[PDB]
């Protein structure tokens, strides 16, 4: 009923070298040594002990910490050992708490960057002629950038589009109707004459003057950009919005909606 | 530079119904109504306001709470508004805390379940004759259930094995060597005479008497089961372990190493 270094190591999923190591340092020592083979032998009573020694290591308690507990008799006392552990528990809770306080201060600092980014978003003025776009429309005042959801409805189907004048760039078009809903469209510039994939439309973006803003960030943060633009950015440059169609401009600089390194040009029609 | 319900709703990704709603309740009322179309029109100065109303909603602040704030002047006061929010922030921290306190108490209870399960793990005695097993062998006193790792090394290769006498059941065999290492093997019972997939072995489990323990739980918890077995479960039944080969027994009752619903018979050779 005595166990070998190998049976012990097995049931605890450790290597026999560890158990040798523990023997040299007098931490966990075998009840005896094989008198005809020099092997180490352990009693079943030692199992629960190795179990605690190993329980400490899973808590990253350094080995010598452990050895000190062995030496001063605290490892083999359920009360002292418990004390050691609550102390370590306490430290862990604190280190966690401390970092939480940091994530808040960090959360705080990210916001401040947003006002900074928006402060640096300068208008370039430009006129562009009418042009044609084919893709997936959505007529209607809907909540969400369920457009983030539209784009993901549109991406599997993009390949279907013949006649792409420049497949490197795409558009997130929003048109106003006097009725008051917006008509959004995700698409690609295509020459007239090409066929429209089933369930797709062809939209004509009229000739317009624009203020172009380079949104440098995430697609969900696009709405914030629009908000600044319409609350003050235009005015601050004595520009007036014109009723018309605006669009998001996606080219090489765009690398995914959730990717903070994506730029997107915002084409705001003006007077 | 007045915006429509439609441009407003878009740049905030909400539906125009929401803006109608906010107007009827007097919460967010447009600066005017279209006199030739009865439409609603908003000033760019209302953007930041709608912005905060909506920020509250993202905090699940109910709408009526919000309307209360609007009514009692607090909503338009950066100081009162801030106070409202720290209050709410406070509540959230408390609710989180409370639940942590419960996770700990829950952790404690899970542990107590373990001793209970081990107490109910009864030995059934059984003799089985020698039998042959084919699979992937590991020689050597290794740490970790890198046996968890062996099984996942072995599984892509299982299909290769011809002559499987009973593919429903596999074995996790551990054999002891005089030098004290253990020799582990994951495999299937296969009749003699069948060829051995390259890099695989054929191990012979000798005829033995066993105590069988049904481990009901997770493969990582298998080691604890072994620990109970050799520390006292055998003694309590006046059984004595015999030097030999033990094995884990996987049949239908086994549903995967991570599934708390798996059972595994543990075959412990005895006198
Ligand atoms: N070569 C060697 N092996 C060791 C030694 N100490 C432990 N073992 C291994 O541990 C098993 C059981 O050891 P035990 O608890 O002393 O329990 C032992 C022990 O109580 C007794 N026993 C067997 N042979 C001897 C012996 O030569 N001298 C003594 N004093 N007792 C023995 O029978 C039980 C079963 O022994 P086994 O079935 O042979 O299997 C033995 C043996 O494989 C050692 O000093 N030398
Ligand atoms: N009262 C007190 N005395 C301290 C403290 N830190 C160091 N000492 C003293 O300095 C000696 C060596 O510390 P070390 O180089 O960290 O080397 C230490 C340390 O690395 C490790 N150790 C012992 N206890 C603990 C522990 O509770 N936690 C950790 N992380 N390591 C420990 O074992 C080694 C030997 O320690 P000792 O033989 O006890 O001897 C210790 C101890 O007498 C402390 O925080 N409080
Ligand atoms: N049908 C209708 N539409 C409305 C009303 N209120 C706002 N809008 C829409 O909002 C846009 C800008 O309105 P604004 O800021 O008053 O700025 C307006 C306003 O300052 C001026 N304006 C144009 N027509 C009229 C008018 O009939 N009366 C007044 N007082 N001003 C007008 O020209 C600016 C640009 O107007 P638009 O480019 O046409 O585009 C207008 C129009 O499409 C309304 O009561 N009825
Ligand atoms: N001092 C105080 N008075 C309370 C409290 N709970 C209820 N009352 C009183 O009871 C009235 C109706 O509360 P309700 O039916 O929960 O209906 C409430 C509630 O459903 C919601 N609401 C208002 N303020 C808050 C708020 O701060 N937090 C939340 N979660 N909901 C609010 O809107 C309604 C507000 O109506 P009121 O004009 O405030 O009128 C409130 C208020 O005068 C409280 O915790 N503290």
Author numbering:
A (entry chain B), B (entry chain A): 0 to 270
Paper excerpt:
BrlR, a member of the MerR family of multidrug efflux pump activators, consists of a structurally conserved N-terminal DNA-binding domain and a C-terminal GyrI-like binding domain. BrlR mediates the antibiotic resistance of P. aeruginosa by activating the expression of multidrug efflux pumps and repressing PhoPQ activation. The monomer can be divided into three domains: the N-terminal DNA-binding domain (residues 1–75), which adopts a winged helix-turn-helix fold; the long central α-helical linker (residues 76–119), which connects two terminal domains; and the C-terminal multidrug-binding domain (residues 120–270). Our most striking finding is that BrlR is not only a pyocyanin receptor but it is also a dual receptor that is responsive to both c-di-GMP and pyocyanin.
The structure of the BrlR–c-di-GMP complex belongs to space group I4. Each asymmetric unit contains two BrlR monomers and four c-di-GMP molecules. The monomer of the BrlR–c-di-GMP complex contains two c-di-GMP binding sites in different regions on the DNA-binding domain. The DNA-binding domain contains two separate c-di-GMP-binding sites, and shares a mutually intercalated c-di-GMP dimer in a stacking conformation with a crystallographic symmetry related binding site. Thus, the overall structure reveals a receptor–ligand complex with a 1:2 stoichiometry. The structure shows that the 2′-hydroxyl group of the c-di-GMP molecule in each site points toward the solvent and is not involved in the binding to BrlR. Crystallographic symmetry analysis indicates that the BrlR-c-di-GMP complex also forms a stable homotetramer, which is made up of two dimers as the final model of apo-BrlR (AA′ and BB′). Overall, the c-di-GMP-bound BrlR has a larger positively charged surface than apo-BrlR on the DNA-binding domain, and the simultaneous occupation of the two c-di-GMP binding sites twists and bends the DNA-binding domain and the coiled-coil linker. The recognition helix (α2) of the HTH motif is 1.2 Å shorter (Cα(H20)–Cα(H20′)) in the BrlR-c-di-GMP complex than that in apo-BrlR, which could help BrlR approach DNA.
